[PDB]
């Protein structure tokens with residue numbers, strides 16, 4: 034087995050995923066239950082995290098649909114200091130980010146385990162700050178909620194970051 038110069042398989046406790054080879058580990062504690070964080074040091078809005086949290090649920094489906102799940106983890110999307118209505122008349126219409134557009138979601142079953150994935154375009158209060166593309170994949174096993182969230186800014190997304198964000202999240206697998 035030779036080294037891939039683009040994607041790096043990473044094995045953690047109970048999970049594995051592909052991490053971009055040119056990204057580096059981050060010691061920033063961003064979210065509850067964080068066990069991994071990697072970032073593009075030359076654009077830190079490109080980053081990924083793996084979180085492992087306790088949950089009362091048995092399956093990701095116990096949260097409801099992918100859209101329901103997103104509403105229950107919307108702290109992943111932004112750090113707004115208040116719960117607020119967005120200006121959408123449907124879809125994501127309220128939470129802790131100023132604006133969120135759900136682009137797509139999916140419910141892949143892999144090795145007999147139900148995963149959710151959801152892709153969301155966000156903005157904050159100052160629209161002098163660029164929009165972000167955030168992809169969240171998640172599953173539940175053994176009393177734990179496993180989350181992989183990867184993201185990149187709009188411009189970086191269309192200059193190759195898409196591949197890395199979507200690959201990281203879609204590769205995320207729990208034993």
Ligand SMILES: [Cl-]
Pocket residue numbers: 154155164165166186187
């Ligand atoms: Cl965007």
Ligand SMILES: [Mn+2]
Pocket residue numbers: 120132
């Ligand atoms: Mn708007």
Ligand SMILES: [Mn+2]
Pocket residue numbers: 154164165166186187188190
């Ligand atoms: Mn965009």
